[PDB]
Amino acid sequence: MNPIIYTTLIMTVMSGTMLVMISSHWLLIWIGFEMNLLAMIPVLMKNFNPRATEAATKYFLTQATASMMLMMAIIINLLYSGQWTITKMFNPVAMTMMTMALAMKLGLSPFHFWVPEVTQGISLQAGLLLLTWQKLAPLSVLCQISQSINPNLMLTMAMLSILIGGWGGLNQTQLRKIMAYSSIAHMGWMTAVLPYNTTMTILNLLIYITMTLAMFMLLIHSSATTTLSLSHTWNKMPVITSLMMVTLLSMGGLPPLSGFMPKWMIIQEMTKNESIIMPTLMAMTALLNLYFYMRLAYSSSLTMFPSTNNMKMKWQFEHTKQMKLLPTMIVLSTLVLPMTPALSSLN
Amino acid sequence: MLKIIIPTTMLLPMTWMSKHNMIWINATVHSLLISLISLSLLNQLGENSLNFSLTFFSDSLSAPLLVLTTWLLPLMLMASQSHLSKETTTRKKLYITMLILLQLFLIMTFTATELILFYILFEATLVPTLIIITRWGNQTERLNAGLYFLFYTLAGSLPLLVALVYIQNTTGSLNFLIIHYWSHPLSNSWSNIFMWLACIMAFMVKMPLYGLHLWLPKAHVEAPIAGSMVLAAVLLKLGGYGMMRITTILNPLTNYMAYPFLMLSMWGMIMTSSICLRQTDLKSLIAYSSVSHMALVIVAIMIQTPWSFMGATALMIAHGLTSSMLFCLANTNYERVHSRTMILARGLQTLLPLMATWWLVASLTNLALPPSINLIGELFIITASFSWSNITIILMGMNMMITALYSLYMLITTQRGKYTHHINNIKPSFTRENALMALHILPLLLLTLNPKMILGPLY
Amino acid sequence: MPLVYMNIIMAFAIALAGLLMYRSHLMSSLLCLEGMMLSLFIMSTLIILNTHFTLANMMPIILLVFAACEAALGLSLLVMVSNTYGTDYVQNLNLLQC
Amino acid sequence: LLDLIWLETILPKTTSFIQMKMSIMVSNQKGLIKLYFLSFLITIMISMTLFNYHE
Amino acid sequence: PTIRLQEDPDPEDENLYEKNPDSHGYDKDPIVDLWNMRVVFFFGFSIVLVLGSTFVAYLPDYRMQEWARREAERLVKYREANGLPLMESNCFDPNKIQLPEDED
Amino acid sequence: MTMMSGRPGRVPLQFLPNEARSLPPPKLTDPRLVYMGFLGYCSGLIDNAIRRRPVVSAGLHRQLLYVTSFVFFGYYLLKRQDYMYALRDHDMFAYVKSHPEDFPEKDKKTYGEILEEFHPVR
Amino acid sequence: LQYGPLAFVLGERTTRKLTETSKVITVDGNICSGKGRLAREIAEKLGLRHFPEAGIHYADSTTGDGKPLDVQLSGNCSLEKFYDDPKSNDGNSYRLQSWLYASRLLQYADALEHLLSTGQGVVLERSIYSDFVFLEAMYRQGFIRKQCVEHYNEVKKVTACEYLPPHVVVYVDVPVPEIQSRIQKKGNPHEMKITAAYLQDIENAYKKTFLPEMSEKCEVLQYSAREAEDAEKVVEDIEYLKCDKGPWPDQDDRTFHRLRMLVQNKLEVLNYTTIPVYLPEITIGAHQSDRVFQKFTELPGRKYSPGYNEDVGDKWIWLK
Amino acid sequence: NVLQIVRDHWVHILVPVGFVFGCYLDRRSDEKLTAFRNKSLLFKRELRPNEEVTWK
Amino acid sequence: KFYIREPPHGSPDWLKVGLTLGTSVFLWIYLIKQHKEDVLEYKRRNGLE
């Protein structure tokens, strides 16, 4: 693929997201989703092989079904009230359709099956893009229509997302599938607090995006897509594996690391309403994500696995392409908790 | 109290800027100086606490714990440098960095005025300990031990956080002074019962409570020597300190609620003391002894009387010192013979006489020989329990017997008898090990000379 | 609503169920996708004509445009799939699991 | 009997067994779009019935 | 190869007394080891231990024990001389306490 | 639930309205700004470490730029956060003042008049 | 500026630099045949860059300073001990074969990078497409196991598919008795132990797999021993080849861009050499790996990046 | 000759400097809690002819 | 001693170093000026001086 064509496609994906984010008309939001999907499909197939083709096909089918349900919800809302503005969604059936369609777009359980498969079938760069940038638009729409949400449905889907993310990620040896299941669980966390405070949703999204970017950039830096491939990195770059371990600690939610900030705040917010049982269950379930992060850290950093002979040659060469934003992303993903009150700037 | 906090954060770059052959010297010297500085916190008042600022305060309950932590750091530095000789410079600096971060977290934990900051620091203490255990441990089970050390803690502490924030939505503050002054009774309802359990079970799992103690033998046996020292000396006392702090809001629900934990603690001290009688590993025996003593402390905090609180404070300090000394003593033999089996090396009094004297003093202090502060705390707790109910003297009494047995048993198995014939590499004791033992043991008797400094705020 | 509105919504539901239930061919599911788009066009046109929303009369046309894109996209993918297996069967898209 | 077997059986081993079984249940999917698109249909119908009809 | 991989043999432990018969067990460098011993002994026993015990022993009475004793002596003297009871069952004056109007 | 998005008089993408100029600016020695500079220094050190350069000595201009950028962003971040908290307090006080029926200041009772149940510890 | 997407967007295009003499040339032949002299002569006459055959220490000559490093920190294999004890129980034979394949892959990447950056032709002795014959000669003699051959095939399958085959393959044919006589006259005491079965296996591997399958990609120039000394005749034969049958003419500018990004960044080239397949011959335990890596990092110009080692005379570090 | 000695033993001032800085910061923190200085019912006192504050 | 060019030479890239230092000093000067103006403006609005 031409570099100019690739740049144009990335800009089109971004422009679709911003069109969703700046629009006041439902038709323009649907158009932004359409344009984003159309430009996103070739990015998944940038390196051509049967697995990438299958992943792109599954992604296209899922997103097309979700977009059709979105259009149906918009049309029903227009039928019961001639309103095109993105607002309190005057019809409950249309709101259920919208919630289900946006959940399918986000990968929320039980519309979650496509995320691990698509993430596994594509490269690490496309996985980074899919798991970071592709969450903004549906979450922005959900934040906009939060007042008319049915708390039961989204809370059910969020709890299911956390549970399924933990359980599914428990069984994975492939790094991309581990990332996909972590994404599902974090999606559940962000959607659990949406009916109560959108600022907490935005904060959680930002922290998750920073952590995911750092993780994926570290996985790109050391060309590892499996656990056994990552177990060789200590014999080539030990600092990378050390930073990887601290990043995994932060993603696990342990204090005083930055990954503790969102959950903490979310729990606090849910106790400002009554909502006592749900945060307790959510934390107890997030312990599973912590477990498989810890297992990865055991495999890559806290123990030394056997290596190969040809690794010696790799000692003589250096990394040519250097990611400029990796150190800042690592620092933000680890040492940011003392700046917690700055979240007031989000609202 | 930044005059103690800042010097540790300065210990960090001093370690990372030191020459390759001068890290241990600098770390030890400046840790000792920091301990000397922290000695000034013992000048406490009789009515209120030393309120340094809006964020930090010193009470009569936390000052001895802070002094114990700052004193323990140089001891761990001295103990660690023997088995890390072949390690590279960067990894040695990383190990020292982990120890310094742990000490900083503990120092900030023992003086936080708010309960949520206390929670954050008391949970931040997990990361360096887990890294130390799972990276610098010796055998393969260490990984499993780390997992047992982690989730056992978090499963107890995640509910507490919820309870904490809930309280701040009801009373409007988590500051310990405002909490104490504006205290209100707890009603007898299911919501209040579960609030009590959420507030209590984290500290229970930290002590640990009998039945919730399975993480401790694993973690304390698989960890390196400094990890074992800090785990047994200070990290167990976080649960007791937190429980003594949090019990101010749980009255009068505590009388009804405590019963199962009291029975668990008493029968569990009996059971763990009995377990110590049949143990083939030397480190596991010390771990289970720690469990027994902490069960006694749990009973003391739970019955909620002034004498019981003084006993709990004294016993916590005494147990910290004694357990650290015992772990170091065991590690000397392990470093000699590269095995933890207790019957492998026998008759060591013949080969190492002064080391046998150290063993004798440590075993004597473990069984609470008077007038050591071990016995002071134990006797105060026993008197409080007798006032609570005259039948407790049975169970406590049985403990006082079994303890002595296993303690002396340990000594008799290691020092007396005839030496193993085929073990021909028992080198003479170094100055470092003898100095470590002396620096463990002398403060104990010095504290006995002046006991009101470790009796807590109820004095 | 009249009977026409429920008939159109019923057609949309039938097409959605048809897409969600795969038999063997990808082309059949693509056809169900186009059926959903057609039903949405009809429903939106009826709602706009009934209420005399003049400026909204252009929205269905725009809808059709993006429909074409979706169709083209699907067909493109279909070609690649066939080139790998010689058939358009969805049973062959099983290299990736959960 | 108590420390090495039953205290282990109840708290940590039961938890590990349950989590492993649920992980095997959740992650054992053949990757066929037919099956979980049928699941999507079931989910949509259930959500339209249980939550949407009760407003 | 009947082997599973290439590994170094397990090395034997080095004895510090072999190269330095008076080793102190601190370091393999004799000068560094000697100075480690010196600093540990000086700053552990000479500085922290003895001077810290001396400092703690002479800590000024902020717990207010002698003050409480003198106050108790004054109160006991006054109450015994005036014939008042030494201690009263009420620590608060009942004149400042308003009990509820009705107990039925 | 959005609390402050619909607040009247809000300019969409201002990040610092003119009213915020009425508040005292954060001091240049604010410990939060010092922590932001520490974050910049840490980023510089990690940048040196990843590229296999002497961590403490490799690039002084790069480390200086890191620290300066972090401080520069943190100053305005702190300004906006302080403005938001001031707005919250102002709105709270105005609402309390304008709704006296909802916030009644009832009679204060001394502890000599309130009956508190006593629960003995025994 | 470093080559990349930006350099390709504006200006730089590879296809304009190819001036009918790009012509990657490899000259194959059995052991002790005069293929090196023929390669040097071909490069001299045609004005192409000659690449001496990649040995155990090829990677050392291209990084840091060109001086070779210790065998413990580089290679961890010996050809002399392969000749002495071909059936060693420490897996020296397959370790040497695997390291040699990796070195040949690195050399091919270097040659391709030079050709694509400058447009000047390159001549090579052996290539990744020719290495397998030695492996076959090891397998038919019982020197290595079948799992070693399987691992070699996996690495070759994932590596050699990303490059282009040579334009012209030159072969020098020497009879096995003549090879033995040349080895005898050479005087190296280790090559004297090469049995005729080994050389025969190499010759069958060549003449039955290498030439028949490389004749489909491009025409093969076979020369006997006597007609290999006349280098000018061989060169003039090379100048009259009609090369329109291989993948090379079907390479447009985007595939050249991809190949150029692949040949640089040698870590990407060597990625799949160290796949986590645990054969005892090539697997190294954690303790030895740690020791050898720590030893490597203490070399005079290896701890930091090439321009940041002040112990070899690097200045103004604190402004780089 | 002291250049080498300093470059070797300059890390021995970090901890005393940190201690002094901590004392200074503690004094600065004490400076911000004077809202009830010489105002409590128990210790309220008429100032001496020369002194300005009862405690710093 | 390098066998290759080692594009980073003994002397640093003076253009990039100068740009970095200039950006840092410009940012610091702008921050100081902004803080001064903010303090003056606040004092004016609240009428302290």
Ligand SMILES: CCCCCCCCCCCCCCCCCC(=O)OC[C@H](COP(=O)([O-])OCC(O)COP(=O)([O-])OC[C@@H](COC(=O)CCCCCCCCCCCCCCCCC)OC(=O)CCCCCCCCCCCCCCCCC)OC(=O)CCCCCCCCCCCCCCCCC
């Ligand atoms: C809370 C209070 C405040 C504390 C804040 C939190 C902590 C500090 C901030 C954290 C970030 C700071 C440093 C980041 C860059 C570190 C990267 C690195 O590799 O360092 C090596 C580097 C040495 O490398 P080199 O000199 O080029 O030559 C040796 C070779 O590189 C040889 O290198 P190699 O690559 O060949 O060796 C391989 C090695 C290399 O692997 C590593 O070095 C691991 C480094 C990972 C960095 C941490 C990750 C990101 C930050 C998160 C921190 C989490 C904190 C929260 C608590 C949880 C703990 C994890 O990997 C291993 O061996 C695997 C061992 C497995 C151990 C696993 C434990 C790792 C996590 C430990 C993190 C602890 C916090 C950082 C402590 C500082 C570390 C230098 O260390 C340094 O020299 C820099 C550190 C000190 C610089 C600051 C000093 C300033 C100047 C002194 C004057 C002070 C001014 C006072 C003001 C008043 C005037 C008087």
Ligand SMILES: CCCCCCCCCCCCCCCCC[C@@H](O)O[C@H](CO[C@H](O)CCCCCCCCCCCCCCC)COP(=O)(O)OCC[N+](C)(C)C
């Ligand atoms: C090797 C051979 C050994 C045998 C030979 C030994 C020779 C004799 C030496 C032994 C001395 C015998 C001791 C007998 C008692 C005399 C000392 C005693 O009188 O002093 C006490 C004082 O002792 C000190 O108070 C206790 C020492 C303080 C202990 C602190 C430990 C140092 C810090 C190190 C770190 C600690 C870590 C643990 C954290 C809790 C009295 O307390 P006090 O009634 O008031 O004094 C009243 C008058 N004042 C108040 C004006 C002073």
Ligand SMILES: CCCCCCCCCCCCCCCCC[C@@H](O)O[C@H](CO[C@H](O)CCCCCCCCCCCCCCC)COP(=O)(O)OCC[N+](C)(C)C
């Ligand atoms: C893990 C660390 C997370 C950090 C995240 C990245 C940090 C760097 C990103 C820099 C942000 C650039 C923004 C500055 C340009 C001006 C744009 C400005 O006009 O935006 C305004 C708003 O300003 C931004 O929102 C503030 C962004 C600040 C982000 C930092 C907060 C992170 C929480 C605490 C973590 C510690 C931070 C440490 C910093 C290094 C618009 O207000 P408004 O249009 O009405 O709100 C839209 C959303 N609504 C309506 C739904 C409410």
Ligand SMILES: CCCCCCCC/C=C\CCCCCCCC(=O)O[C@H](COC(=O)CCCCCCC/C=C/CCCCCCCC)COP(=O)(O)OCCN
């Ligand atoms: C390794 C072992 C560690 C595991 C121990 C973890 C168990 C801890 C105990 C359970 C804590 C749950 C409580 C969470 C915080 C409660 C705070 C609170 O006060 O909320 C109550 C409500 O209380 C609750 O909602 C609690 C319900 C419990 C839900 C979660 C159940 C978790 C498991 C319960 C049984 C476990 C028993 C203890 C563990 C035994 C050891 C295995 C009041 O809320 P309102 O709705 O406003 O009521 C007044 C107006 N109506």
Ligand SMILES: Nc1ncnc2c1ncn2[C@@H]1O[C@H](COP(=O)(O)OP(=O)(O)O)[C@@H](O)[C@H]1O
């Ligand atoms: N892939 C290989 N496997 C085993 N031996 C090899 C390999 N490549 C080269 N050699 C050894 O290199 C030696 C000489 O190489 P060769 O090219 O035939 O001679 P010359 O240097 O004169 O051209 C021979 O002993 C040959 O065995």
